[PDB]
Design a protein around this ligand. Structure first.
Ligand SMILES: Nc1ncnc2c1ncn2[C@@H]1O[C@H](COP(=O)(O)OP(=O)(O)NP(=O)(O)O)[C@@H](O)[C@H]1O
Ligand SMILES: Nc1ncnc2c1ncn2[C@@H]1O[C@H](COP(=O)(O)OP(=O)(O)NP(=O)(O)O)[C@@H](O)[C@H]1O
Ligand SMILES: [Mg+2]
Ligand SMILES: [Mg+2]
Lengths: 621, 624
């Protein structure tokens, strides 16, 4: 009844699939060949550990690239283990059969090798470019053989009897007409640097330049992340960073770590000394067994840490058939979690070095505050890295932890004020009273600060209070409260008169507890956008205008009872309930308060015209 | 001497390779199986054309998806052509052997068939989820067979004697415990909608529910792909229905561009302009690529420019170099050609829509930001995008006019397009800079949005006429001989006052002089020729991510321009001649400069100083 069968494969169609569909970019053939060559070396090197006599054929392990435009041939020579005739038929001649994996599983216990080859289809990627491939191999055991093929479903193995190759393999690709750009020095150098830059063995490119053969070592920067982090000095770290980033300045700080368990990977991160000019408009590169896999973009690192330049190297990771992406995206999330944790730890330990942390903060404070805006899980740890200019700080910047340390015994919040400049904020009207009482105020004078404090609601159990927002309530004395209530009862009449005069401009006009020298100030409502925040949002190039009015706040006017102007205005308003002079005066006062508070003016020409008219009245016109 | 050989393939490792390495996301197995079913149907339908009697076994072409969580089996049934025992052994058994490809190539002439299958490795993707796959087939010629395997390098073919199927193939996936999420109704619906939405034949999801344990049938591909139809025959109601089904918006499509491109790269595209603007427009699946009515990839800016991402629609192709996983292409030049054609047809669509005045008003009000972003970025398509611009001008009124109309009404002697940028229409219209120009009857373009600065950074001229910012220095209107004589006389007279004001406001204004752009305001602050305009500086001084040092590289060199015909300026000149220095004249000059700085759009370096000066002036005025 039941008739069992066995799976088969269409060799011609399978070869066509490998040639045409597996690999998107045709330049990766080098990446494969060198990889195979690397493995060819690794094997023999391993066999040299317990038997040095196996290296008598050749004492040197190297890789050579020889472009010959005369015959349009790209040659890749390696002094590796080489392949026997049986190895030629079984390994090269069989698709999906890798000799490297078979060698790897035949190792005793846990050895020190880790070879790239896993799938068995890497070699045929050479036919992405070549129209014919000739592999001249010479193993230590049997004689030198030649393997010729053109991906036509058949290949020929022949005794070579050519010039001896010592030990190893020489792969000659007869490039097709279209893909002749790989004979150029520039293309070969670029490809090798992009893909197989960190191969352990020296890769030498031969060329012809009177007329002599010139040799150039394509890879010279040894991958230092493999070495133990404790052994590496700072000079080696700087050299590696400079070679990696083409930067004359060395690194500012370096975090070299390793994660072991079900997911083993070691990473090396660098903080640049300065910030890139272009910046926001390649940061982290993922390596598997020391060969390039993919370039990180929002996967390994968040957007706000895109200034970190580094490498991630893993011995075992699921890989695409094309060896340029991973199979499981969850692994990328795990890598990101570990990298972010180690980066925050690096920043925290860097905060001890005062001058270095000053440089780092001056460079990447915008990134830190962007992370506070975005990374909700790391807000509590990122906030401790914030440095701000305060009233008690002076020229230097102090952290919020220092603020809490110096915070008065009865103070219950951290008072902050935002503006477009440090001078405007320092001389601003809102902080006039608080500084009189001795409470430290935090100046935040960058556009990213508004985004930072949209999310950073509190810190160290102390809430942030905006001085320029309504409902500010400093601790009060009983006498101060009595005076405030009496002044409110006295000035309610002028307040309602001003409210009547300033219709649809100010929702509420009240006396203020935050003014000591300025006559009046315009203060944003509780939930709406602050003046500075409204200025920032109004200037965004790509943002909906029709929605702005939903988030725009309602202005509140606050008058100072002790300022002479307000008292005189109150007396005039009581004496004359309606008058042209008082109306003009209150309109001008509101205009000045609007200008000083931070708000833009709906028609500044009107205010300027009023000033010009009063100037004319001053000098006579 | 020379010993030829033949290539081989290690079958077990090859199968493991297909299962583990080809496909990243495991949900695509349906995408493959459904596709096979589609092909299975196509063939039989073709064989009905020359032989209707061959459909006597079953007259219905359909696809059924039956999840059975009791046995953890996902069944996919199709009434397709079916496979013989020989086809079971060869087509299903042999990897990389596509019987569909053989059927396609054996077709004579060029037939309407365009079957999805091309590689021969699609079926084994079913082992991404299943631990054992059973395929019950019934070809129209031989008896019903059963093909069972577990990807262990061997499969068994058995003469089936269960419930007859009549015709077609029924594949049963015994899902592994980990991948049990595909027995859920929601997951199956989501996968089918994402991948196999536009398969020509109906797809039905049989299920068991209670309303007492009834069987519910639900079709998951009700929407049909209309882009295959000729664009002339389609009506606006059908286009609206397609847009609603594709985008899940109650609003209709604002406009539609449906076009086919033939040749060495043949593809049909269907683009829709949303009536409104998405809330997260600038905060990634607008254009979806299809090959033979199967979803391939989302246009992550490959098919469309970034500024044109507001446009929705589909791109469908028949012949296209496809990846092994069918989730991308092999050549990016194909994507570049696709993008070029899409952009050309989008610009043509916008030009056509510009005729419809009300519809173009809606479209512009929705996507003028995108148009100006394109002008900033897309350099090749600047003439058309510029011609698609509508602006508020001084002579326009409330309604908006194009720059071409501005040039049409442009005076005979005028030789430029005078524009002024600001943060509001009222502020710009009442601004001092345009006081003289409008007095002489020259139309001025109000540019009252932040993106306008980026738009005019690149758009240097239009129709051979150069754009000139009134707020920038060197503004030279066409001037007569007597006007130039008056300007020279004023330059002669106010030289001493200009020198005094330059001395007083040291390191704050580079140059103080007379001007021809003021008729009523005393003074104005004017940006230099090279640096950022005042509005530009205001805009990029408020960007969240900006380089402070770079801010200082392109700062404007402020120029003060006074009005010789303003009474304040003449009185100030008289006083400055009376006293080479005085406190009153210095205070007046500083206050005038501050007012000009405020009106010009420049933010004060310290508003507290100006406010305190005004407060002191008020105190003196009312008496303190
Ligand atoms: N230069 C070489 N020297 C020695 N052995 C080689 C060489 N090139 C290839 N081989 C062997 O031939 C096999 C076939 O090559 P290849 O297709 O690259 O397999 P693979 O590299 O192990 N699989 P992959 O992960 O894609 O690199 C290899 O696995 C090696 O065993
Ligand atoms: N439901 C079915 N009815 C009939 N034939 C089927 C069915 N499912 C699979 N086949 C056959 O299976 C063969 C190979 O399966 P498949 O893995 O889909 O290769 P394919 O058809 O080329 N699809 P693809 O690999 O994506 O190009 C096809 O040529 C069909 O003849
Ligand atoms: Mg290899
Ligand atoms: Mg298929």
């Amino acid at each position: 009844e039941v008739e069992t069968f066995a799976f088969q494969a269409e060799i011609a169609q399978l070869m066509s699939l490998i040639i045409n569909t597996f690999y998107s970019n045709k330049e990766i053939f080098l990446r494969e060949l060198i990889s195979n060559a690397s493995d060819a070396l690794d094997k023999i090197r391993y066999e040299s550990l317990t038997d040095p006599s196996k290296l008598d054929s050749g004492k040197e392990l190297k890789i050579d690239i020889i472009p010959n435009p005369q015959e349009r041939t790209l040659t890749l020579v390696d002094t590796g283990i080489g392949m026997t005739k049986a190895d030629l038929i079984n390994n090269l001649g069989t698709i999906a059969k890798s000799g490297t994996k078979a060698f790897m599983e035949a190792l005793q216990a846990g050895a020190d090798i880790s070879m790239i080859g896993q799938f068995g289809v890497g070699f045929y990627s050479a036919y992405l470019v070549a129209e014919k491939v000739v592999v001249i191999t010479k193993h230590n055991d049997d004689e030198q053989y030649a393997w010729e093929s053109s991906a036509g479903g058949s290949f020929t193995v022949r005794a070579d009897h050519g010039e001896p190759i010592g030990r190893g393999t020489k792969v000659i690709l007869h490039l097709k007409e279209d893909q002749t750009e790989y004979l150029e020095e520039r293309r070969v150098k670029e490809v090798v640097k992009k893909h197989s830059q960190f191969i352990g063995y020296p890769i030498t490119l031969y060329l012809e330049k009177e007329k002599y053969i010139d040799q150039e070592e394509l890879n010279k920067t040894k991958p230092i992340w493999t070495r133990n982090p404790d052994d590496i000095t700072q000079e080696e770290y700087g050299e590696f960073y400079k070679s990696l980033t083409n930067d004359w300045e060395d690194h500012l700080a370096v975090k070299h770590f390793s994660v072991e368990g079900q997911l083993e990977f070691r990473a090396l991160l660098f903080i640049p000394r300065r910030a890139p000019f272009d910046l926001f408009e390649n940061n982290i590169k993922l390596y598997v067994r020391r060969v390039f896999i993919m370039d990180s973009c929002d996967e390994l690192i968040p957007e706000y840490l895109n200034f970190i330049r580094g490498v991630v190297d893993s011995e075992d990771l699921p890989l695409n058939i094309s060896r340029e992406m991973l199979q499981q995206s969850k692994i990328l999330k795990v890598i990101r979690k570990n990298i972010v944790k180690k980066c925050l730890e690096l920043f925290s330990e860097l905060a001890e070095d005062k001058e270095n942390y000053k440089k780092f903060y001056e460079a990447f404070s915008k990134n830190l505050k962007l992370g506070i805006h975005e990374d909700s899980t790391n807000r509590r740890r990122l906030s401790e890295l914030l440095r701000y200019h305060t009233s008690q700080s002076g020229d230097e910047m102090t952290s919020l932890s220092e603020y809490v340390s110096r915070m008065k015994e009865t103070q219950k919040s951290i008072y902050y004020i935002t503006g477009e400049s440090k001078e405007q904020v320092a001389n601003s009207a809102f902080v006039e009273r608080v500084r009189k009482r001795g409470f430290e105020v935090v100046y935040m004078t960058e556009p990213i600060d508004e985004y930072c404090v949209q999310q950073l609601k509190e810190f160290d159990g102390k809430s942030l209070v905006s001085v320029t927002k309504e409902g500010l309530e400093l601790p009060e004395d009983e006498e101060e409260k009595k005076k405030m209530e009496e002044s409110k009862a006295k000035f309610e009449n002028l307040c309602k008169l001003m409210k009547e005069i300033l219709d649809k401009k100010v929702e509420k006009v009240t006396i203020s507890n935050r003014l000591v020298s300025s006559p009046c100030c315009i203060v944003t409502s509780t939930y709406g956008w602050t003046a500075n925040m409204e200025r920032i949002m109004k200037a965004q190039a790509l943002r909906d205008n029709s929605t702005m009015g939903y988030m725009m706040a309602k202005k509140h006017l606050e008058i100072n009872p002790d300022h002479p102007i307000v008292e005189t205005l109150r007396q005039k308003a009581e004496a004359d309930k309606n008058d042209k002079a008082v109306k003009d005066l209150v309109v001008l006062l509101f205009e000045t308060a609007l200008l000083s508070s931070g708000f833009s003016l709906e028609d500044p020409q009107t205010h300027s015209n009023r000033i010009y008219r009063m100037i004319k009245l001053g000098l006579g016109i």
